[PDB]
Design a protein around this ligand. Structure first.
Ligand SMILES: OC[C@H]1O[C@@H](O)[C@H](O)[C@@H](O)[C@H]1O
Ligand SMILES: [Ca+2]
Length: 309
């Protein structure tokens, strides 16, 4: 009756993980037999490690961990193994060797590559439809790219495959600049402001961001320079970003399904806390201890299936 599940969020003010945290809390408030103990790791893996020791001292029956550093998976598994507590890692994917090292380690996330291919197809679709976006009329997309954290599975796959997909759809590309803005709105605004103040400013035709928070910072820098006709694409379909696709400030985004990843994390951690099989009594499909929830492309044409038009 007191099933205790310990949850760490790598940083509470990351925009997307804020949507995921609130949905896990909602699922916990809804289940009368579960108590969730939620922690903000404040983007520090040492802080997270200490929080996991306190959760284990408090007797949690399962841990649902969103890692600060994907490479710390082994440290967390060794803490959990000692007390035979199952661990459901979510959103930052650990290595396969770390997942295989413990039979009660699972992961809930997405297939990262798919969000890069869907973003590439959304760009391809809108580029073909808007020939005026080709400012210098050379048939090539001149773009800048705002990357998430270096080494994060989603940042690396989204950066690689958005361009690979455009080239496979037959659209040649020329990267004018690329830099990391660490998934953050303010850092992205500053980097875009710098590019709009440098020698390439007039040549930028498309802004590609690995997530919506960075797309939103770019939209702010573009408005400040009265360059709001430059299309911006993101990933996550945050409610604030959906507002920008409606107003045309953004051209498209990709739904990163926070509700189902939160639901799957909660369902697997509750089952495992109860000594049942991870997917018992659910529809989740676990393959090799991983659940991957699909990404969905979002633009003005299917916007009504995600928000009110
Ligand atoms: O690890 C946290 C990151 O996860 C990504 O999947 C998401 O697109 C980013 O916005 C950020 O939340
Ligand atoms: Ca061009």
């Amino acid at each position: 009756a007191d099933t205790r599940i310990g949850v760490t969020i790598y940083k509470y003010d990351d925009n997307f993980m804020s949507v995921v945290r609130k949905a896990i809390e909602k699922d916990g408030k809804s289940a009368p037999d579960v108590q969730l103990l939620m922690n903000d790791s404040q983007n520090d893996q040492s802080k997270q490690n200490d929080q996991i020791d306190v959760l284990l001292a408090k007797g949690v029956k399962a841990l649902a961990i969103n890692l600060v550093d994907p490479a710390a998976a082994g440290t967390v598994i060794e803490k959990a193994r000692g007390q035979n507590v199952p661990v459901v890692f979510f959103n930052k994917e650990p290595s396969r060797k770390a997942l295989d090292s413990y039979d009660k380690a699972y992961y809930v996330g997405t297939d990262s590559k798919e969000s890069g291919v869907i973003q590439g197809d959304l760009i391809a679709k809108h580029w073909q439809a808007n020939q005026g976006w080709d400012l210098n009329k050379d048939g090539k997309i001149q773009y800048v790219l705002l990357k998430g954290e270096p080494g994060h599975p989603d940042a690396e796959a989204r950066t690689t495959y958005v361009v690979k997909e455009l080239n496979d759809k037959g659209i040649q590309t020329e990267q004018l600049a690329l830099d990391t803005a660490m998934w953050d709105t303010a850092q992205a605004k500053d980097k875009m402001d710098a590019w709009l103040s440098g020698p390439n400013a007039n040549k930028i035709e498309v802004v590609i961001a690995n997530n919506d928070a960075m797309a939103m910072g770019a939209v702010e820098a573009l408005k400040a320079h009265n360059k709001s006709s430059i299309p911006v694409f993101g990933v996550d379909a945050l409610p604030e970003a959906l507002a920008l696709v409606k107003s045309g400030a953004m051209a498209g985004t990709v739904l990163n399904d926070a509700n189902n990843q939160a639901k799957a994390t909660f369902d697997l951690a509750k089952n495992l806390a109860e000594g049942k099989g991870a997917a018992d009594g659910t529809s989740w499909k676990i393959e090799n201890k991983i659940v991957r929830v699909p990404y969905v492309g979002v633009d003005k044409d299917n916007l009504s299936e995600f928000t009110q038009k």
